[PDB]
Nucleic acid binder design. Structure first.
Length: 139
DNA sequence: GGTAACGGT
């Protein structure tokens, strides 16, 4: 497959992309990431500069997306993928949450039917230059 | 599957 900017993704179509992890949270059910590539998407949650946790080091407005990791993806990443990290995510499922916003899902797939993956990208890879340059323009 | 843009587990 080929990669999309997060501006370009749509619901209920699998997609692949590079992003920076802004926030992580593991729970007894799953592992949740909130990631950005500093491109805007009209179906993304508008993050408030006002009501957001002071911890949030990400952008505001429709710039970030929730990724929910289940099962093997939970187990793999929950103590591994850190806030601030870069990741490449491949063939992940997209849908709409209860409030109308786009989100990413990595569901259990022991057969690797859909060839989903998530892996860290070393900070120094050129594949991450764009995110970096778009962040500069953002700040 | 969880369902909200918390927490810091």
């Amino acid at each position: 497959d080929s990669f999309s900017l997060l501006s370009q993704i749509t619901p209920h179509q699998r997609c692949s992309f590079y992003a920076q992890v802004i926030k992580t949270w593991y729970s007894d059910k799953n592992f949740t990431l909130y990631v950005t590539d500093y491109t805007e998407n009209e179906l993304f949650f508008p993050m408030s500069p006002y009501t957001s946790s002071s911890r949030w080091r990400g952008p505001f407005g429709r710039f970030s997306i929730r990724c929910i990791l289940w099962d093997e993806h939970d187990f793999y990443c929950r103590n591994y993928i850190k806030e601030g990290d870069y990741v490449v995510m491949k063939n992940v499922r997209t849908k709409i949450d209860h409030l109308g916003y786009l989100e990413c899902i990595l569901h259990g797939d022991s057969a690797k039917r859909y060839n989903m993956s998530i892996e860290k990208v070393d900070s120094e890879e050129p594949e991450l230059n764009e995110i970096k340059s778009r962040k500069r323009l953002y700040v």
